[PDB]
Amino acid sequence: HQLQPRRVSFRGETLQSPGYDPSRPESFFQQSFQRLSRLGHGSYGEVFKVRSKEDGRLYAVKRSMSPFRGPKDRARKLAEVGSHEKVGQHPCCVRLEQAWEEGGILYLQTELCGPSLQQHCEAWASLPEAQVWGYLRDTLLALAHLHSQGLVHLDVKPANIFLGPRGRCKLGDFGLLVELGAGEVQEGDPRYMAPELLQGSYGTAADVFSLGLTILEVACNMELPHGGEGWQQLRQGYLPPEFTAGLSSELRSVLVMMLEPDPKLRATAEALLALPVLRQ
Numbered sequence: 001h002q003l004q005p006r007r008v009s010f011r012g013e014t015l016q017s018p019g020y021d022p023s024r025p026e027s028f029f030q031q032s033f034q035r036l037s038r039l040g041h042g043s044y045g046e047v048f049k050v051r052s053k054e055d056g057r058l059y060a061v062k063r064s065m066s067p068f069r070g071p072k073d074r075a076r077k078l079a080e081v082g083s084h085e086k087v088g089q090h091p092c093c094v095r096l097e098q099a100w101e102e103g104g105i106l107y108l109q110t111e112l113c114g115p116s117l118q119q120h121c122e123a124w125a126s127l128p129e130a131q132v133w134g135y136l137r138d139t140l141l142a143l144a145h146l147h148s149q150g151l152v153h154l155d156v157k158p159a160n161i162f163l164g165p166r167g168r169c170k171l172g173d174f175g176l177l178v179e180l181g182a183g184e185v186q187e188g189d190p191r192y193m194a195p196e197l198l199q200g201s202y203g204t205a206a207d208v209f210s211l212g213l214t215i216l217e218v219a220c221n222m223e224l225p226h227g228g229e230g231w232q233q234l235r236q237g238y239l240p241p242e243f244t245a246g247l248s249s250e251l252r253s254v255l256v257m258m259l260e261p262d263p264k265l266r267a268t269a270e271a272l273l274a275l276p277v278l279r280q
């Protein structure tokens with residue numbers, strides 16, 4: 001026999017939902033959602049576009065790949081939900097609707113978003129810069145929100161930022177969020193990593209640096225180095241001309257503020273948002 005689905009939350013039960021019958025053998029996920037498409041799959045699991053039977057609206061649902069192997073494995077996976085709950089509701093962050101576990105599998109149901117910035121770039125040669133400014137501003141708003149909550153995203157990158165309506169950006173994938181102890185956290189993508197993280201040092205500034213390289217990459221449509229001399233030369237306090245062909249003086253000026261190697265000299269999200277060029 002199989003235990004009933006249980007809600008996963010770190011705030012304050014078995015899952016009951018209109019349309020869900022525990023008497024029937026299919027999973028909560030099978031009974032309570034219509035699977036429309038698969039949006040992604042990897043070792044992290046699978047992500048589906050679904051329609052909810054409870055309210056008729058569209059959502060995304062992520063489910064892990066294999067059953068929990070032991071109590072610590074379970075605890076580490078469930079921690080994503082606690083982190084996401086700390087982020088809560090914000091128009092530039094992917095909103096978690098509910099999470100549950102059934103059959104040793106973890107499900108996160110969120111609002112449905114569009115393609116990642118990685119995907120949008122790939123299927124776009126370069127993005128119009130007005131689009132890029134929108135993505136920069138919206139993800140800065142997300143970072144100001146995270147920092148307001150004493151949170152740092154240690155894996156800001158094009159794959160973790162999702163398009164929304166009319167040019168809007170939402171930051172997601174909060175499994176590598178840390179609170180300002182740190183908690184367990186996995187290896188972020190070296191391409192976008194702030195230099196201080198090599199010495200294990202982190203803070204609000206690290207995700208500003210990663211957003212800087214994220215936006216640089218999408219604006220120039222060139223792969224950033226994962227190590228070696230080219231990695232070092234993006235972390236010196238200048239923009240290598242290799243990456244700035246086409247980029248306006250205005251965008252360059254803001255990126256260099258974000259890419260300052262000394263996290264004490266690096267701009268904050270709120271200071272960037274207060275720049276005339278990022279108004280509204």
Ligand SMILES: Cc1ccc(O)c(C)c1-c1cc(-c2ccnc(N3CCOCC3)c2)cc(C(N)=O)c1N
Binds near residue numbers: 059110115162173
């Ligand atoms: C379901 C969910 C739960 C928590 C969460 O934080 C998020 C973002 C999502 C969520 C994830 C994805 C998605 C699609 C394909 N690949 C990835 N990847 C992950 C990072 O590595 C690359 C591959 C992610 C798409 C959407 C969507 N469009 O609505 C979505 N909401």
